[PDB]
């Protein structure tokens, strides 16, 4: 069972680029594509959640680990 949410640029396993592991229950700032995205790793579902409550960019993916 999961301890991190793992964030990627891309959703296809063949081409996606791993960005960051974020401990579940914490927030972290990812830098990708020239911008900063502050994500909350809320729980083991690892929904992609920006701390401003706005929609994350569609390319940002997450998976539990």
């Amino acid at each position: 069972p999961a301890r991190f949410c793992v964030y990627y640029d891309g959703h296809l396993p063949a081409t996606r680029v791993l960005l960051m592991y974020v401990r579940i229950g914490t927030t972290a700032t990812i830098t990708a594509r020239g911008h900063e995205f502050e994500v909350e790793a809320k729980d083991q579902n690892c929904k992609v959640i920006l701390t401003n409550g706005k929609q994350a960019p569609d390319w940002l993916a997450a998976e539990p680990y």
Partner: protein, 71 residues
Amino acid sequence: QQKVVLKVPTMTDEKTKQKAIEAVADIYGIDSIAADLKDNKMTIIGDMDTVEIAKKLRKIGKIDIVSVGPA
């Protein structure tokens, strides 16, 4: 609470980036682990023990500690 920046020259693709992260991902007190192929840079933020980070990554390869400082 510290930010640790490592150079991990074995990270050359997605598989080797993931191997490097897996070597450190069980260290107590890590909040985030970023890795970038660009400058073979791994960034660890938490209240973990940097000495453990170094110990665990040596089995991977030859790593450099670039910086350790406040988060």
